[PDB]
Design a protein around this nucleic acid. Sequence first.
DNA 1: AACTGGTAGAGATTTTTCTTAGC
DNA 2: GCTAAGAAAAATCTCTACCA
DNA 3: AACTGGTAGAGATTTTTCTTAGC
DNA 4: GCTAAGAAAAATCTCTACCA
Lengths: 207, 125, 252, 48, 193, 49, 47
Amino acid sequence: SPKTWQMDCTHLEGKVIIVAVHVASGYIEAEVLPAETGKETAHFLLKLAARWPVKHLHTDNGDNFTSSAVQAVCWWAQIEHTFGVVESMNHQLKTIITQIRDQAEKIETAVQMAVLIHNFKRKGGIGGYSAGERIIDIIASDLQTTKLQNQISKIQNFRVYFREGRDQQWKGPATLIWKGEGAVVIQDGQDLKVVPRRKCKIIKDYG
Amino acid sequence: PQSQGVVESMNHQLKTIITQIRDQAEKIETAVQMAVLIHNFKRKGGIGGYSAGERIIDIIASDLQTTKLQNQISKIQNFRVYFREGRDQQWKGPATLIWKGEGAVVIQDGQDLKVVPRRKCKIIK
Amino acid sequence: FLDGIEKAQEEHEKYHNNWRAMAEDFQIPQVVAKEIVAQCPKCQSPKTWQMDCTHLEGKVIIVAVHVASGYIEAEVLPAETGKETAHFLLKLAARWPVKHLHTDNGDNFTSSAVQAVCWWAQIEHTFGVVESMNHQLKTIITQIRDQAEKIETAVQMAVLIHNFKRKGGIGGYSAGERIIDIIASDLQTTKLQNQISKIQNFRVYFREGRDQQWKGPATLIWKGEGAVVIQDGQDLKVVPRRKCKIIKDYGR
Amino acid sequence: AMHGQVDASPKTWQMDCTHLEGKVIIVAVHVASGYIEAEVLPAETGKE
Amino acid sequence: GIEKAQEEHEKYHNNWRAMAEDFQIPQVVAKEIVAQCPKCSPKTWQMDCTHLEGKVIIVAVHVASGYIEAEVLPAETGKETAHFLLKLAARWPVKHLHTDNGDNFTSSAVQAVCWWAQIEHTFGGVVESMNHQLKTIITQIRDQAEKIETAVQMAVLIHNFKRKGGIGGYSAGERIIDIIASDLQTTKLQNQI
Amino acid sequence: GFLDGIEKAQEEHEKYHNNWRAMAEDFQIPQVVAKEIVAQCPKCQVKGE
Amino acid sequence: GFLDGIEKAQEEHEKYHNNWRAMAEDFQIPQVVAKEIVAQCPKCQVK
DNA sequence: AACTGGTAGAGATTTTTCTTAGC
DNA sequence: GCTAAGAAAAATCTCTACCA
DNA sequence: AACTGGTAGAGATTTTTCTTAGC
DNA sequence: GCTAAGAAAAATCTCTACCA
Ligand SMILES: [Zn+2]
Ligand SMILES: [Zn+2]
Ligand SMILES: [Zn+2]
Ligand SMILES: [Zn+2]
């Protein structure tokens, strides 16, 4: 599924970190929470819903994941929330945090640098792609499918006034099918035909 | 002179408008520009009930929009079609399927568009 | 149908969309979508041009720029009197639809000839982008100066390169495609507004189910082949044609 | 006894020159819509 | 194609990106064509800061698609601007940063983050339109939430995925995803061939 | 109504000399009134039958 | 033309408040403009 | 071997819309 | 309450002069 | 209140006429 | 012996230039 996200939380250095993972490509967005209440959890979920298209969410039966603020944000953003990979991503994130700890003063700088390293600097898999290339390719393919299915009718919503052989009157508004370089395919009275380019006028005809 | 018949007909229309609004200007150049304005935006009727300016705007905008739409459609296509036509029952190479209709299909071969009935074609995914 | 209308109402209550997106997504006709947009209390220029005069190599150039897309029409004047400025304004009003002119407080812009041209063409003249377009046009003129003999040839070639060759913006379009798309959108809006008023000059008596009485006069929105969309009590609903009587309304 | 059919491509223009009151008018027409531009020339040379 | 590009640049002096798109030439030849004239980017982000109800709102806009990303700052110092730039570099690939001649963007911490993230930092009519549109959306949906932070985030969501306007009829997120995907496939095919 | 439309169409035909379809579509007056406005002009009426 | 008829019908309905068919048969205007003249009156009603 | 008549208006004839008498 | 005769109003078809 | 366009030819499409194979 | 496919030959319809 190209639009399913999972969430989890953990502890590090006395803080509380929350990690959200796009499952189909392994995309990690993590933030540092100053508290474990439902307000900042729903705020992080709202920022995730505003940055990336989230259509299906999967969480655990926690105390801050069961909140009226989280229910209000999921209702406002039209998210299907279900209760029930992320542990392996948390293990990878903690190992990268311990790898580049010696360059960060605070904790949040090391957390965001570990997120950047895991997202763009660990090329693995089969094809040799990172995680950002995988999530961009997956969402682009799904959007290309849906927009193709709409754009067929969107290009068939035009009108063509054509001219036939040895008749000096412009015919009625037949429907356009495809506009080539030197030929135009129209449909007129459930009859498909091909007219040259110099014998057609293509209008949208607002009226 | 019948080869460029459109511009001679427009000469006749422009001269009639110039004779209609001659008494509102001093020189002839002002009357020419006012006749151009009167012909362009104050006379409706024709193909779609438009004037001249609305029709040229609609034509160029529809051309640009249909080129962008068919590029974005045709860049993600599939379903190649092998078809059989001609006076002899031969087989031609890879052609692109454009539209699958109830009765015939539209194929593109060698940058040429053709309409082939569904009895003489087979689609390979 | 009715499910699509209720989904469009909930979507516009949540996100405050436009009417084109709802008419494309929810598969409702555009008059109903524009009605839903116009009934929102929280949801309530393509014909403006700017003029300028400049000097270059002993000549006087006049530039008229369409503001909403950046479209430059330039010409070379023999002098800087009011009559040639009025003649250039008349040519610009003859080729493109002009309804609002923005100028500065020059002398030749304040004349009886320009006033008579604006009165005959019905243009609102306002005395106060253009400097940036003049900088870009003069850099292009100094870029391709050597390929022309006179100055007017370089001026017209710079206008052509600025209009149809330099591409930028969000989608990467030139200036001519932007002005043509903007004017086409305005034309679509005016045609749909005329259809909206001509349909909304009616009245509908509707009869509810399991009742043999006619209800109050609801306003017609869209008259279909089997369904009829009416507005009543600040609410939209769909009633079939067998329970409706469409009468003319003289309610000016 | 037959007639032809001129080109009607969406980017084709036709041009001509005519006389009126001793002046020389020049007319250019966009064919597929009927769009007229016109000017007045001082002479009928090639530079104008 | 190369002769067509040389004739087109000799006639109208086009830039190398439009010639590489319209004539299907790899970018190094077009760069050398533009560099050999005597008379003569999908990863560029523009940054700005504004004020609203006493708060400081920082706004980063992706230019070639019109994508927005906004945040509420508690102060106008340099460390918070460097932290927001670090989060922006950790979320999306940033190669060219455009800013104004300001005080917070010209700081040692922000320059250290720019050095660590390898971003070209440059100082110099789109961002004003984006800020004005964000202000109109904020004034539209102000009464649906209490604080200004929730209103800012809901305005970012509405501007990103609920405004299907323009010529193509595309929102901002679909445009930036398609642009970066097509640029990645172009660089992959150019590195292969 | 359209009575001010009729007066404005009379002044606009007095200045610009439109045909009847342009006035009937711009000012939303019925076509018989626009045809009569065109028919009451002496600068017009140049055609056979 | 009947444009002066439309002006005289406006004056006559402003004085005497005639109905639409009476003005259409007297001043010889079409029935749509006479019905609109009766429709624009706030005191009258077309019936 | 690669070129070409078209535009707008006046009446006549057919079709749609609106008001009202009869059952 | 419902149907249909009848008249007005809008949509469509055929035919001609003028531009060179 | 008593006046007005017509003639002949080139192709395209439909109809009639003639010869011959099949049962 | 009779019928019908098929091709040639004659009859009919539509459209244009020129005369002032
Ligand atoms: Zn709204
Ligand atoms: Zn150059
Ligand atoms: Zn007139
Ligand atoms: Zn009254």
